[PDB]
Design a protein around this nucleic acid. Sequence first.
DNA 1: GCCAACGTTGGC
DNA 2: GCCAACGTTGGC
Length: 68
Amino acid sequence: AEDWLDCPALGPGWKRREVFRKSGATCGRSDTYYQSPTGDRIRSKVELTRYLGPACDLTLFDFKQGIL
DNA sequence: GCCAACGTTGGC
DNA sequence: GCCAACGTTGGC
């Protein structure tokens, strides 16, 4: 199952999804995606740190797993 | 032009 | 050799 799920560590409206690669050299590797409350797609802790503003300190946030 | 999906790269 | 970041590409 790789549907969108709430991500409360990030806060109301945020969605997360983990997808397993199906073919190629990297079959079985996974990738984690986020979707912002406003619909913006994020695929890296760098895109996400830039998005949320200085307000948020993600030092202790595991982007891959979605936890603190 | 966008994006799902896999490839490539650099720091570790 | 893993993995985070992001590059590339074909199908839409």
